[PDB]
Write a protein that binds this ligand. Structure first.
Ligand SMILES: Nc1ncnc2c1ncn2[C@@H]1O[C@H](COP(=O)(O)OP(=O)(O)O)[C@@H](O)[C@H]1O
Ligand SMILES: Nc1ncnc2c1ncn2[C@@H]1O[C@H](COP(=O)(O)OP(=O)(O)O)[C@@H](O)[C@H]1O
Ligand SMILES: Nc1ncnc2c1ncn2[C@@H]1O[C@H](COP(=O)(O)OP(=O)(O)O)[C@@H](O)[C@H]1O
Lengths: 659, 39
């Protein structure tokens, strides 16, 4: 319980660095730079360099995906660490590449791939190990085949590497490029629960033989058709170590009740014959078409053979079924009940923070440039799902191919070489490919996190007591923000969640006037979209559409009933905005619907930005058009092309016509 | 006396929970600060 560490995820995806807690390293006589022997299971062991990282837990150790596969261990297992002082540098180490990775790529694995790996990098060696080198639009696994000083060699600039030879084979070594948790970004929190409910029925299939508890059995994934579904299940079963069969919807419908009734039974029989079963019902929208009263006799039996095959079967037999649909409202209601799909999982469009991680993952095999600032691209990529974030990663890597052809001609079948690596991908390959931009998820209810500073407010002493830490031993839950326009009513609730650390949903009046108003309308889709997100603030601007001048005066009443009931939720709040508080029906003001009213001294301080092309105030006070005078001041950019930034003589020309 | 907002003044009195983290429960000097803006 003191040396027994639990393997965890790696902050840095390095095959040699494993991070640990320093107070635990203070117990086991270790500091940075020293090497440690780590043996996990099946008598296998490797050896790596430690580091003092206080981020990890005390009884937990950080291990990388390739470090995990070398010990024949997987995440959630206990490993033992031993001090390794008896180690010395090595003379010769023979490195052969792996068969399943040298696909057409040729040249010299040492000059292109292996040199940058070990250049000034001091790394330990095993006699029988495998490892991955990400470079040149791909990744070629290598194998250590010999070790000169016993089995614990250490590479250094003083080392002779005879990489000459044949592509060695692999032996029960799962592809180190297979899907993993380090390959799924933008849904870290979404992976928390899915990894808290499949962690036991798959990794610990012991208690579930002798416990009367009914374990989770029916998982229902949903989200965007663009991305975020197949990998959520692929990165789990391929990483947790579970048998993975993914039944595709379109194939089943391609029969005449032949492989429609068989593959449904057979794959349900096949997955159960193995102990860890993960069944991915891809395109369940095509199989289950909600309550389709007008259809053919095959959909009335392909869904009729599915429910009976999961309530009778899939009962403590260590089988976790996983559905996948574009919308959780186009499949039969009898799918989500008890035992079958009682679990549901939201896959939302990645926020600005989540877009950056997935950008990193896919942009790893490439060699980029320092002018490339993927952070700036990670901001202006709303409406972009993991597919489109990978779709431009192709058009960004492929634009570098034609733009740098030139001398290379008469391409051989295996012409790739060191030219493939070091292929610097300029930022223009992004911009020109992003010039033909094409997003997908634009009409969606976006879940994200506000990244705006509270300094740019200049308010009127907003009482801090309009907040709570969910620690009490009833509280008001309805507030509205009215007053003049521009004073801050739109950006007001944005900076509140900056300190509260909660998701937000910006909704407008005519947004609820969606043609898809025919109870679980978008109105209720938006309500329940923020129900899973806990806590979540529902901001509503343009609420002036409450009055008159079909379902004209409807949707309001529709909005009314849904507001109540949320008072028991406690961890959810509703805020609105308006400018003409007269034509609004006073219904919302009623207790429960809303329970507070906030207006909007003198002109307050306001924090600007863009302080680089700036040039050096409160007297002008003698917001409304705060940004309007700012952008026009930047628009007054002197074009004396044939130094100057901002100036005063340009302000006086702006207030001549403003209002 | 010299309902309308019966619970409103009650929860705000509990919301006036002194956070002197670095005993006190309900008090009068916190009521007078509540009726300054009520309606
Ligand atoms: N959340 C994510 N994180 C990282 N990559 C993703 C994510 N979602 C999608 N991708 C990438 O997009 C590609 C296609 O998306 P996919 O998962 O097939 O869509 P879906 O599962 O919704 O049909 C995948 O190959 C994957 O690499
Ligand atoms: N302290 C501030 N208060 C209000 N608005 C500000 C402030 N500082 C900058 N602004 C700018 O003024 C604009 C006012 O919000 P806006 O989007 O115009 O919505 P509305 O006019 O409906 O309130 C913001 O977009 C913001 O860029
Ligand atoms: N004697 C009382 N008479 C009325 N309301 C009371 C009384 N004691 C406490 N209250 C509180 O005042 C609130 C008044 O009811 P409310 O839910 O506001 O509906 P409405 O305002 O439409 O009558 C109740 O929710 C209750 O918590």
């Amino acid at each position: 319980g003191s040396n027994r560490l639990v393997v965890d995820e790696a902050i840095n995806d390095d095959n040699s660095v494993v991070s640990l807690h320093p107070a635990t390293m203070e117990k086991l006589q270790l500091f940075r730079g020293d090497t440690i022997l780590i043996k996990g299971k099946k008598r296998k062991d490797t050896v790596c360099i430690a580091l003092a990282d206080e981020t990890c837990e005390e009884p937990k150790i950080r291990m990388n995906k390739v470090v995990r596969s070398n010990l024949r261990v997987r995440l959630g297992d206990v490993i033992s660490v031993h001090q390794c002082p008896d180690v010395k540098y090595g003379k010769r180490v023979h490195i052969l590449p792996v068969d399943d990775t040298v696909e057409g790529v040729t040249g010299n694995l040492f000059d292109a791939y292996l040199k940058p790996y070990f250049l000034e990098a001091y790394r330990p060696v095993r006699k029988g190990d495998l490892f991955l080198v990400r470079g040149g639009m791909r990744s070629v696994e290598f194998k250590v085949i010999e070790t000169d000083p016993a089995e614990y060699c250490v590479v250094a600039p003083d080392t002779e590497i005879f990489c000459e030879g044949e592509p060695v084979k692999r032996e029960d070594e799962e592809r180190l490029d297979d899907v993993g948790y380090d390959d799924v970004g933008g849904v870290r929190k979404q992976m928390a629960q899915i990894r808290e409910l499949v962690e036991l029925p798959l990794r610990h299939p012991q208690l579930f033989k002798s416990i009367g508890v009914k374990p989770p059995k029916g998982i229902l994934l949903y989200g965007p058709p663009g991305s975020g579904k197949t990998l959520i299940a692929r990165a789990v079963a391929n990483e947790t170590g579970a048998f993975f069969f993914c039944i595709n919807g379109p194939e089943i419908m391609s029969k005449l009740a032949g492989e429609s009734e068989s593959n449904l039974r057979k794959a349900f029989e096949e997955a159960e014959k193995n102990a860890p079963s993960i069944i991915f019902i891809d395109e369940i929208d095509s199989i289950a078409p909600k309550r389709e009263k007008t259809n053919g006799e095959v959909e009335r039996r392909i869904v009729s053979q599915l429910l009976t095959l999961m309530d009778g079967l899939k009962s403590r037999a260590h089988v976790i079924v996983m559905g996948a649909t574009n919308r959780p409202n186009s499949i039969d209601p009898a799918l989500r009940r008890f035992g079958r799909f009682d679990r549901e999982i939201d896959i939302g469009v990645p926020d600005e923070i989540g877009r950056l991680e997935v950008l990193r993952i896919h942009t790893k095999n490439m060699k980029l440039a320092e002018d490339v600032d993927l952070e700036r691209i990670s901001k202006d990529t709303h409406g972009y799902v993991g597919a489109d974030l990978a779709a431009l990663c192709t058009e960004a890597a492929l634009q570098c191919i034609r733009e740098k052809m030139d001398v290379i001609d008469l391409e051989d079948d295996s012409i790739d070489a060191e030219i493939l690596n070091s292929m610097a991908v300029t930022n223009e390959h992004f911009h020109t490919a992003l010039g033909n931009s094409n997003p997908s998820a634009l009409r969606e209810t976006v879940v994200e996190v506000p990244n705006v500073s509270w300094n740019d407010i200049g308010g009127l002493e907003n009482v801090k007591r309009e907040l709570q830490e969910t620690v009490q031993y009833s509280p008001s839950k309805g507030v509205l923000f009215y007053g003049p326009p521009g004073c801050g009513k739109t950006l007001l609730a944005k900076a509140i969640a900056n300190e509260c650390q909660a998701n937000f949903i910006s909704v407008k009046g005519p947004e609820l006037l969606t043609m898809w108003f025919g109870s679980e309308a978008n109105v209720r889709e938006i309500f329940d979209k923020a129900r899973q997100s806990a806590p979540c603030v529902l901001f509503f601007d343009e609420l002036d559409s409450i009055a008159t001048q079909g379902a004209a005066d409807r949707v309001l009443n529709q909005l009314l009933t849904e507001m109540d009931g949320m008072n028991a939720k406690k961890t959810v709040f509703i805020i609105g905005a308006t400018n003409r508080p007269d034509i609004i029906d006073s219904a919302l003001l009623r207790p429960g619907r809303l329970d507070q009213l906030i207006y909007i001294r003198l002109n307050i301080f306001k924090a600007a930005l863009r302080k680089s092309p700036i040039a050096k105030i409160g007297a002008l006070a003698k917001g409304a058009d705060i940004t309007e005078i700012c952008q026009r001041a930047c628009k007054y950019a002197i074009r004396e092309n044939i130094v100057s930034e901002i100036k005063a003589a340009h302000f006086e020309e702006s207030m001549k016509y403003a209002r």
